[PDB]
Design a protein around this ligand. Structure first.
Ligand SMILES: *[C@@H]1O[C@H](CO)[C@@H](O[C@@H]2O[C@H](CO)[C@@H](O[C@@H]3O[C@H](CO[C@H]4O[C@H](CO)[C@@H](O)[C@H](O)[C@@H]4O)[C@@H](O)[C@H](O[C@H]4O[C@H](CO)[C@@H](O)[C@H](O)[C@@H]4O)[C@@H]3O)[C@H](O)[C@H]2NC(C)=O)[C@H](O)[C@H]1NC(C)=O
Ligand SMILES: *[C@@H]1O[C@H](CO)[C@@H](O[C@@H]2O[C@H](CO)[C@@H](O[C@@H]3O[C@H](CO[C@H]4O[C@H](CO)[C@@H](O)[C@H](O)[C@@H]4O)[C@@H](O)[C@H](O[C@H]4O[C@H](CO)[C@@H](O)[C@H](O)[C@@H]4O)[C@@H]3O)[C@H](O)[C@H]2NC(C)=O)[C@H](O)[C@H]1NC(C)=O
Ligand SMILES: *[C@@H]1O[C@H](CO)[C@@H](O[C@@H]2O[C@H](CO)[C@@H](O)[C@H](O)[C@H]2NC(C)=O)[C@H](O)[C@H]1NC(C)=O
Ligand SMILES: *[C@@H]1O[C@H](CO)[C@@H](O[C@@H]2O[C@H](CO)[C@@H](O)[C@H](O)[C@H]2NC(C)=O)[C@H](O)[C@H]1NC(C)=O
Ligand SMILES: *[C@@H]1O[C@H](CO)[C@@H](O[C@@H]2O[C@H](CO)[C@@H](O)[C@H](O)[C@H]2NC(C)=O)[C@H](O)[C@H]1NC(C)=O
Ligand SMILES: *[C@@H]1O[C@H](CO)[C@@H](O[C@@H]2O[C@H](CO)[C@@H](O)[C@H](O)[C@H]2NC(C)=O)[C@H](O)[C@H]1NC(C)=O
Ligand SMILES: *[C@@H]1O[C@H](CO)[C@@H](O[C@@H]2O[C@H](CO)[C@@H](O)[C@H](O)[C@H]2NC(C)=O)[C@H](O)[C@H]1NC(C)=O
Ligand SMILES: *[C@@H]1O[C@H](CO)[C@@H](O[C@@H]2O[C@H](CO)[C@@H](O)[C@H](O)[C@H]2NC(C)=O)[C@H](O)[C@H]1NC(C)=O
Ligand SMILES: *[C@@H]1O[C@H](CO)[C@@H](O[C@@H]2O[C@H](CO)[C@@H](O)[C@H](O)[C@H]2NC(C)=O)[C@H](O)[C@H]1NC(C)=O
Ligand SMILES: *[C@@H]1O[C@H](CO)[C@@H](O[C@@H]2O[C@H](CO)[C@@H](O)[C@H](O)[C@H]2NC(C)=O)[C@H](O)[C@H]1NC(C)=O
Ligand SMILES: *[C@@H]1O[C@H](CO)[C@@H](O)[C@H](O)[C@H]1NC(C)=O
Ligand SMILES: *[C@@H]1O[C@H](CO)[C@@H](O)[C@H](O)[C@H]1NC(C)=O
Ligand SMILES: *[C@@H]1O[C@H](CO)[C@@H](O)[C@H](O)[C@H]1NC(C)=O
Ligand SMILES: *[C@@H]1O[C@H](CO)[C@@H](O)[C@H](O)[C@H]1NC(C)=O
Ligand SMILES: [Ca+2]
Ligand SMILES: [Ca+2]
Ligand SMILES: [Cl-]
Ligand SMILES: [Cl-]
Ligand SMILES: [Zn+2]
Ligand SMILES: [Zn+2]
Ligand SMILES: [Zn+2]
Ligand SMILES: [Zn+2]
Lengths: 694, 694
C-alpha cells in the first residue's frame, strides 16, 4: 500500500545525518556564492528525488554585511582618546574549521554606520518594562547614552526599537551566561554551552511583516521600483553591535551610578550590574565608543521551489517550507530542519516513482535570506499572493528540528490541533523510558497543557520565522514542530547564531542517533501527508471555538483592571462574547454536516473543503492592524513588544496596553471599543463562512 | 424545456408596467417609513414568487435631510441686508400629485449648515479644467467667494471638492437648459424636458468607495463603533444648494467682472455668463447669501436579500442587484430598474415552482440608500465580504432601465463582452425599423464601437452606482445595461432627480408599450441566467488581453507627451507591455485548455471555473490605490475628476496628471515609475492565475 505508513517508514535517521553533514561544511550566508551553489544542489537533487518541477525563484533584496577591510568593534576610550580596550574582531573558530574562509564576523545586520561615544546605561533585556522601570521608577534618562543590553526574553529588534525610542545613541548586545550557559555543562567543543568569546549574530529590523525593506507589498523582481533608504521599512537609526560575555565583562565591570533595582536585573557575571549612567569615580572620565562600518546593499537571493502535482486537486497547495541560508555553518539553524525537509522530499519522491501522487499538490520550499528578515519567503509570497490566497491549504514550517532533546514542541493554528493529536498517537516516542509508547504519551507527560488533563501543550504561533507571511499576512493555516529542552529545569539553545553551531555540535551533544530528527521528520512529514491526502481536510473548526472563548475571557480580564473607565466610557465586551458563542454554535452544526454529508458527492465535498480552507482566511482584515498593514489576522499577531511571541486579539490588547498612561483617556478608550467592534465583527464573519452557503 | 428561452418568454411588458405604477405612487426616500413599507412588500412578494429565502438586512447609516421647519434657500441681499430675491422653497408639484405629502424639497444631501454671504463667481461645470482656466489663465481667485456652477459633465461631488479646494465658501448648483432642455421638446407634463422651476437633487459626498461615512471598512450594524462627524469620510466642508434655471437666471443676470473666456462657458440662458467675481456696477454692493439648515443623522436603512439556491454549485453566487430608495417618486430612477428586477424574480420563480433550480445560486437584492452614497450595497458587502470574495461569480446591476428610447447601452468588464454579444444576437430588437432583426444588429448599427467594424460600443464601468463595492473594492466581475438616448444628436435625462420623474413620464413619453423595459429585462435577466447556469462560466479571458493592450498604449501615449522627462528619469513602460504580452499568451493557452479539457471531470471543471471566477479578483491590490483604500482594482477606478467615468490604469494616470505642474519633478516621475511597476506586476500576476496550476 501507498499510505501514510509507507511514507513514514521510508524516512531514515541515517539519511538525515548524511544530509546535515553535507549542508554544514561551509558557511551559507544569504547572498553569497556558496549559498547559490547549495541552492543549485538542492534543486538538482529534488529533481533526482522525483518532483515534477523544481525551480529557482530569485529576488533582489536589501541585505547587510560588515566591511571586510574596516572591522566593527567597540572600545573603552580614555580622556585623551586612547582606546584602552577593544572587543574582539571575530569568534575563535572551532576545532578543525580554523582555516575555513568566509566566516562572517559577529555583527548586527542592518545597523547603520557610526562611531558614537558616550556613557553606558545598562538596561537589562531592554524590554518595554525594563525601560518603564528605568524611566518611570528610577528616573534614569537614556537620552544620548549608549545602552548595553543582554540578549534574551524578546526579539533583538524589539530591544533596539525600545532603546531608540528612549533616545539611546547606540546599542550593545551581549550574551550573559545567566541566559546562555547551562549549569554543569561545558563550553563548546567539550559541551553545548556558549564560550566567553562566542557571539550571537542576527538582524535588528522591525519589519512588521513587510519583507524586503525597499519593496513592501510587491516582489523585489527585476523591474521593481525601490524606495530610497531613507523611506525603507524597519531600519534602525542607531548603531548596534553584539559581543560575548568575556568582552561584556570588561564593559560592565566599571559601571557606576545607580544599583540594579532588583535581582531580576542581575546576570551571572562577577560585576555589580549597576545601571549607570557611566563608570564609577576613578574611571568616570572614560567613555565607550562604537565603530560600525557595515553596509546595506541590494543582493540577489534564491529560493528553491519544488512541486509535486496532486492527482485529484492539483489546484490545492500544501506547503512545506524552511530556510537554507545560515549565519555560518547552520548546524542547528537551519540545516537540521533543511536535512529533514530533504529526506521528506526523498520519501515522497520514492512513493511517486512507484506511481503514487498525493490528492492535493505539495509545494516544497528552500527559502533564502530568512536570517535577514524572512525575505525569501515573503517576496515569493508577495509574488504569488493571488495563488496562495485562493489555493493555499496549509503551511508547515521546517526550520531547526532540534533545540533540545527533552520533548516535542508544536506551535500551530487551532485548526491543526486535532490533526497533531491524532498523528502523534500513531507515532513512536523516541524518548528514553518511553520505548514502545506513543509520541503523544511522552509529549503529554513531559509537556502538559495548562488547560486540559491528558493533553499536550500546543502554543500559538508568533513570528520570527518563515510562516509569518503565510499565516499573519495571508491567513493560511500554519504550523511548526521540533524537539526542545525542558523549560522547568532550563533564551533558546546556547550556541544560537554562533560560529560554534556545527555538525559536531549536533552529532555529539544533541542527537547522535538522529532519532529526534527522525521523529520531527515524521511529525512534519506526517502533517503534510494528511493535509495533502485526506479526503476531508483535517481541520476541526470547533478547536477554534474553544480558544476564541479563552482569548475573549483573557482580553476581557485585562480590560477589567479599569472598571471605572469601563463604566465611564461604556466599554462592553458583549458583542465579542456573542460572536464567539455564535462561532461555537455554527461550528458545531458545521461539524455535524461534515460528518453526515453525502460522501459520494465531490461538489459537496469541495464546498465543504473550501469552507475549511477559507476559515483561517476569514480572520484576515484587509485593512490590517493599526500601523502594521502586513499583520492582517485579527485573532493572532506577533507581540508589538516581542516579535517571537504570539498575541491573541492583538488589536484590543495593544489598545489596552499601558492605557492608564495615555493623556486623553476618552480617545484611548474609544479605540478600545473600536477594536472590540473589529474583533466581534471578524469572529462573526468567520463563523458565517461555516453556515450553509445558500 | 426549462432553458433560457423559457425564462425569457415568461417575462411580460405588462407586468413591468404594473410593478412600476405600484412602486411610484408615493415617495420612497431612504430612511423613511414609506421606504420600509415598500421593502416589506418587496420581501413578501419575492417569497410568493418562489425564492427560497427572503430577508431584510438593515444598517444604521449617516443620512441627511432638510429641516422641515427651517427651509433652505438662497437670497440676493442688499447693502442694508434686505433679501430682495429668494430662490424657491419647493418644486411646483406635478399634476395630480399637488397633494402628495412628504415630497422632500430640493437639497444637496450632506451639506453642512451655514449662512455664508459673498460675491459670486461662475465656474462653468466646476471641472478640474474649469478651475485651471479660472486660476491659471484668467487669474480669478475663488477664495472666500460663493461659486455657482452648472450641473453636467461630472459627478456633483467632484464639483464641490474642486470648489472647496479653490477656497470657495459655498456652492450653488443649477440646471442650465443647455444641458437639461432638449430642443423642440416641451417641459413636463407636456413633454420630457425640465421646467424652469425643476431642480436636481443629489448627494455631494466624496466617499471614494467607503460607504457609510462613519463606519469605513466594517458594516454599520448594531454594535458598530462610529467615527465622530469631524473624522467622517467624504463630507463637504462648505454649504451647497441646487436650484432651477428660473432662479439661476436671477442670480446670474447681474454678474460682472470678466467675460466668459469662450463659448464653451456659455449656456442657453439670456445672460452674459460673466465669471465675476460679483455683480456689475449698479449692483456691485449686492451680495448672495445662502441659508442651509439640513442635518446629518444616523438612520436605519433596509436591503431586501432574496436567495434562489443553486442545484449543483450552491456556494457560487450570481447577484442581480439594484436600489429601491428614490429622491421622490423615482419613476425612472430607480423604479424602472426595480420593476424589471421584480419581474425577473417572478420569472425565475415560475421555473422554480415547476421544479427547476439554476446550477449556481442567484442572489437578488433591493438596495437601500443608494442615493445617499451607495450605502446599502456597500454595508451589505462589507458585512459579507469573505463570502463574496471566495464565492462571488458576478454582479449585474439593475438601476434605471431607460434613460432614452434610442438604443442599448452596456458597461461591463471585458470578461462579459462575449456573453453580451452572444446574448444580444439571440434577442429581438424592439426598435422601429428593425422588426425581425436581432438586438445585436440594431445596437451595433446605432452604437458602433470605435475599435471594430460590425461590433457595438461597450464602455468601461465607472462608478456612481451599486456595483462599485463589488467591482472596484472586491473584484467581482460586474456589468450593467439599459436603453439610452442618441448621444450624436443629444448630462443624462432632463428630469433626473426631480419631482417630475413619475410613472406618467415613463408611460407617456419614454416607453408606452414597455418594450424597451422588456428588452432590458431580457438582457439583464439573460446575463444572470447564463452566469448562473452555463456549465463553464461565460467569461472570455482573451477579451481582457485585448483591452489591456489598448490601455497600455493609451497610458504610454500620455506619458510620451513628456519625452525629455522620460529620458532624464529613465521612465520605461517595457515591463507593462511585457506583462500584457504574457497575459495574452497565457490567456490564449488557457482558452485552448478550456475548450479541450475533459468535459466529464467535475474537479477539472470546478478548477477551471475557479480560475475564471478569480481572474477579475486577481486585479485587486490589497493596498488599494493612493489615498483611496477602497478602490483596489488596478485596471479600473472611478476617475479622480469624475466619479461617473471609469479610468484605466488609474494609478499611473493620476501619477501623470498635471505632472508638469509638480514642484519636485524627480519625486513625481518616481511615482509614475512606481505605479508602472505596480501595474505590470498585477497584470503578470493575474495572467499567472490562468497558468496550469501545478
Ligand atoms: C449572534 O447571532 C445572533 C443570531 O441568532 C445575532 O442576533 C441578532 O442580533 C441583532 C442585534 O442584537 C438583532 O438585531 C435587532 O434586529 C431587530 C430586527 O430583527 C428582525 O428583523 C430583521 C430584519 O431587519 C430580521 O433579520 C431578524 O430575524 C428579525 O426578524 C431590530 O428591531 C432591533 O433594533 C431595535 O432594537 C434595538 C435594540 O434595543 C435598538 O437599538 C434599535 O434602535 C431598534 O429599536 C435590532 O437591530 C437581530 O435581529 C438578531 N438576528 C437574529 C437572526 O436573531 C447576533 O447579532 C450575533 N452576534 C453578533 C456579534 O453578530
Ligand atoms: C513575461 O514572461 C517571461 C517568461 O517567458 C518573463 O521572462 C523572464 O524575464 C526575467 C526578467 O526579464 C528573466 O530574468 C532573468 O533571470 C536570469 C536567470 O534566469 C534563469 O534562471 C532562473 C532561476 O533564477 C529561471 O527561472 C529562468 O528560467 C532562467 O533559467 C538572470 O540571470 C537575469 O539577471 C541577470 O541579467 C539581468 C538583465 O540584464 C541583470 O539585471 C542581472 O543583474 C543579472 O545579471 C534576469 O533576472 C527570467 O529568467 C525570464 N523568465 C523566463 C522563465 O524566461 C518576463 O519577466 C515576464 N514579464 C513580466 C512583466 O513579468
Ligand atoms: C553534498 O552532496 C552533493 C551530492 O551528493 C555533492 O555534490 C556532488 O559532488 C560531485 C563533485 O565532487 C559531483 O560529481 C556531483 O555532480 C555533485 N552533485 C550535485 C547534485 O551537486 C557535494 O559534493 C556534497 N558536499 C559536500 C561538502 O560534501
Ligand atoms: C570599506 O572600508 C574600506 C577601507 O577602510 C573602504 O575603502 C576606502 O574608501 C575610500 C573612499 O571611499 C578610499 O579613498 C580609500 O582608498 C579606500 N581604502 C581602501 C583600502 O580601499 C571602502 O570604502 C569600504 N567598503 C564599503 C563597501 O563601504
Ligand atoms: C584598539 O584598536 C585601535 C585601532 O586599531 C588601536 O589604536 C591604534 O593604534 C595604532 C598603533 O598603536 C595607531 O597608529 C592608531 O592611530 C590607533 N588608532 C586609534 C583609532 O586609536 C588601539 O591601540 C587598540 N587598543 C588596544 C588596547 O589594543
Ligand atoms: C482524530 O481522530 C478522531 C478519533 O478517531 C476523529 O474523530 C472521529 O472521526 C469520525 C469522523 O470520520 C467520527 O465518526 C468519530 O465519531 C470521531 N470520533 C470522535 C471522538 O470525534 C477526528 O476526526 C480526527 N481528527 C482529524 C482532524 O482527523
Ligand atoms: C402595490 O401592490 C401591493 C401588492 O399587490 C399592494 O399591497 C397589498 O395591498 C392590500 C392592502 O390594500 C393588502 O390586502 C395586501 O396584503 C398587500 N400586499 C402586500 C404584499 O403588501 C399595494 O397596495 C400596492 N400599492 C399601490 C400604491 O398600489
Ligand atoms: C429645525 O429648525 C427648527 C426651527 O427654526 C429648530 O427648532 C428650534 O430649536 C431651538 C434650539 O435648539 C429652540 O429654542 C426653538 O424653540 C426651536 N423652534 C421650534 C419651532 O421648534 C430645530 O432645532 C431644527 N431641527 C433640527 C433637526 O435641527
Ligand atoms: C425672502 O425671505 C426672507 C425670510 O423669510 C424675507 O425676509 C423676512 O421678512 C419678514 C416680513 O417681511 C421680516 O419680519 C423678517 O425679518 C425677514 N427676515 C429676513 C431674514 O430678512 C424676505 O422678505 C423675502 N424676500 C422676498 C423678496 O420675498
Ligand atoms: C459566444 O458564442 C461563440 C460562437 O458560438 C462561442 O465560441 C464558440 O464556442 C465553442 C466552445 O464551446 C467553440 O467550439 C467554437 O469554436 C467557438 N467559436 C468561436 C468562433 O469561437 C463563444 O464561446 C461564446 N461565448 C461565450 C462566453 O459563451
Ligand atoms: C532626557 O535628556 C534629554 C537631553 O538632555 C532631554 O531633552 C529630555 O527631556 C530628558 N528627559 C527627561 C524625562 O528628563
Ligand atoms: C541530552 O539528554 C540529557 C537528558 O537526560 C541531558 O542531560 C543533556 O543535557 C541533553 N543534551 C542537550 C543538548 O540538551
Ligand atoms: C486668494 O485669496 C486669498 C485670501 O485673500 C489669499 O490668501 C490667496 O493667496 C489668494 N490666492 C492667490 C493666487 O492670489
Ligand atoms: C422616443 O422616440 C423618438 C425617436 O424617434 C424621439 O423623437 C423621442 O424623442 C423619444 N422619447 C424620448 C424620451 O427620448
Ligand atoms: Ca517586497
Ligand atoms: Ca461601513
Ligand atoms: Cl520551525
Ligand atoms: Cl444600471
Ligand atoms: Zn532559522
Ligand atoms: Zn536563525
Ligand atoms: Zn438610481
Ligand atoms: Zn439616482
Amino acid at each position: 500500500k501507498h499510505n501514510m505508513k509507507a511514507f513514514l517508514d521510508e524516512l531514515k535517521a541515517e539519511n538525515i545525518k548524511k544530509f546535515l553533514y553535507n549542508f554544514t561544511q561551509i558557511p551559507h550566508l544569504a547572498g553569497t556564492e556558496q549559498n547559490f551553489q547549495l541552492a543549485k544542489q538542492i534543486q538538482s537533487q529534488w529533481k533526482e528525488f522525483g518532483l515534477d518541477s523544481v525551480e529557482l525563484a530569485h529576488y533582489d533584496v536589501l541585505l547587510s554585511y560588515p566591511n571586510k577591510t574596516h572591522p566593527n568593534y567597540i572600545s573603552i576610550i580614555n580622556e585623551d582618546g586612547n582606546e584602552i580596550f577593544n572587543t574582539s574582531l571575530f569568534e575563535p573558530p572551532p576545532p578543525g574549521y580554523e582555516n575555513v574562509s568566509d566566516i562572517v564576523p559577529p555583527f548586527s545586520a542592518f545597523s547603520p554606520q557610526g562611531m558614537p561615544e558616550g556613557d553606558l546605561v545598562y538596561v537589562n533585556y531592554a524590554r518595554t518594562e525594563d525601560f518603564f522601570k528605568l524611566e518611570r521608577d528610577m528616573k534614569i534618562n537614556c537620552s544620548g547614552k549608549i545602552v548595553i543590553a543582554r540578549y534574551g526574553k524578546v526579539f533583538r529588534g524589539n530591544k533596539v526599537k525600545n532603546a531608540q525610542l528612549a533616545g539611546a545613541k547606540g546599542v550593545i548586545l551581549y550574551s550573559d551566561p545567566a541566559d546562555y550557559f547551562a549549569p554543569g555543562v561545558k563550553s563548546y567543543p567539550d559541551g553545548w554551552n556558549l564560550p566567553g568569546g562566542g557571539v550571537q549574530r542576527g538582524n535588528i529590523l522591525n519589519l512588521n511583516g513587510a519583507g524586503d525593506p525597499l519593496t513592501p507589498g510587491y516582489p523585489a523582481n527585476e523591474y521593481a521600483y525601490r524606495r530610497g533608504i531613507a523611506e525603507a521599512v524597519g531600519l534602525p537609526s542607531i548603531p548596534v553591535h553584539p559581543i560575548g560575555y568575556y568582552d561584556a565583562q570588561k564593559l560592565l565591570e566599571k559601571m557606576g551610578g545607580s544599583a540594579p533595582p532588583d535581582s531580576s536585573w542581575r546576570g551571572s557575571l562577577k560585576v555589580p550590574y549597576n545601571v549607570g549612567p557611566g563608570f564609577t569615580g576613578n574611571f568616570s572620565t572614560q567613555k565607550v565608543k562604537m565603530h560600525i562600518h557595515s553596509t546595506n546593499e541590494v543582493t540577489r537571493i534564491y529560493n528553491v521551489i519544488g512541486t509535486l502535482r496532486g492527482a485529484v486537486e492539483p489546484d490545492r497547495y500544501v506547503i512545506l517550507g524552511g530556510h537554507r541560508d545560515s549565519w555560518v555553518f547552520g548546524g542547528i539553524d537551519p540545516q537540521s530542519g533543511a536535512a529533514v525537509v530533504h529526506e521528506i522530499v526523498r520519501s515522497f519522491g520514492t512513493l511517486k516513482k512507484e506511481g503514487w501522487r498525493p490528492r492535493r499538490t505539495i509545494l516544497f520550499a528552500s527559502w533564502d535570506a530568512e536570517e535577514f528578515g524572512l525575505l525569501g519567503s515573503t517576496e515569493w509570497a508577495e509574488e504569488n499572493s493571488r495563488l496562495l490566497q485562493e489555493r493555499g491549504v496549509a503551511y508547515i514550517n521546517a526550520d531547526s528540528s532540534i533545540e533540545g532533546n527533552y520533548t516535542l514542541r508544536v506551535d500551530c493554528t487551532p485548526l491543526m490541533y486535532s490533526l497533531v493529536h491524532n498523528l502523534t498517537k500513531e507515532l513512536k516516542s523516541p524518548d528514553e523510558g518511553f520505548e514502545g509508547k506513543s509520541l503523544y504519551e511522552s509529549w503529554t507527560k513531559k509537556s502538559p497543557s495548562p488547560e486540559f488533563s491528558g493533553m499536550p501543550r500546543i502554543s500559538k504561533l508568533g513570528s520570527g520565522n518563515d510562516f509569518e507571511v503565510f499565516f499573519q499576512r495571508l491567513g493560511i493555516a500554519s504550523g511548526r514542530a521540533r524537539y526542545t529542552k525542558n523549560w522547568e529545569t532550563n533564551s533558546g539553545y546556547p550556541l544560537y547564531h554562533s560560529v560554534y553551531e556545527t555538525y559536531e555540535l549536533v552529532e555529539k551533544f544533541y542527537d547522535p542517533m538522529f532519532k529526534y530528527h527522525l521523529t520531527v521528520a515524521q511529525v512534519r512529514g506526517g502533517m503534510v501527508f494528511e493535509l495533502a491526502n485526506s479526503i476531508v481536510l483535517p481541520f476541526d473548526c470547533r478547536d477554534y471555538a474553544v480558544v476564541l472563548r479563552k482569548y475573549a475571557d483573557k482580553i476581557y480580564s485585562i480590560s477589567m483592571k479599569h472598571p471605572q473607565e469601563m463604566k465611564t466610557y461604556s466599554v462592553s465586551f458583549d458583542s465579542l462574547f456573542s460572536a464567539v458563542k455564535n462561532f461555537t454554535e455554527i461550528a458545531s452544526k458545521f461539524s455535524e454536516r461534515l460528518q453526515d454529508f453525502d460522501k459520494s458527492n465531490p461538489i459537496v465535498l469541495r464546498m465543504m473543503n473550501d469552507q475549511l480552507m477559507f476559515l483561517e482566511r476569514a480572520f484576515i482584515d484587509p485593512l490590517g492592524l493599526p500601523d502594521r498593514p502586513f499583520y492582517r489576522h485579527v485573532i493572532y499577531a506577533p507581540s508589538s513588544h516581542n516579535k517571537y511571541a504570539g498575541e491573541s486579539f492583538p488589536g484590543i490588547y495593544d489598545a489596552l496596553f499601558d492605557i492608564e498612561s495615555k493623556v486623553d483617556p476618552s480617545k484611548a478608550w474609544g479605540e478600545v471599543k473600536r477594536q472590540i467592534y473589529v474583533a466581534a465583527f471578524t469572529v462573526q464573519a468567520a463563523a458565517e463562512t461555516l453556515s450553509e452557503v445558500a
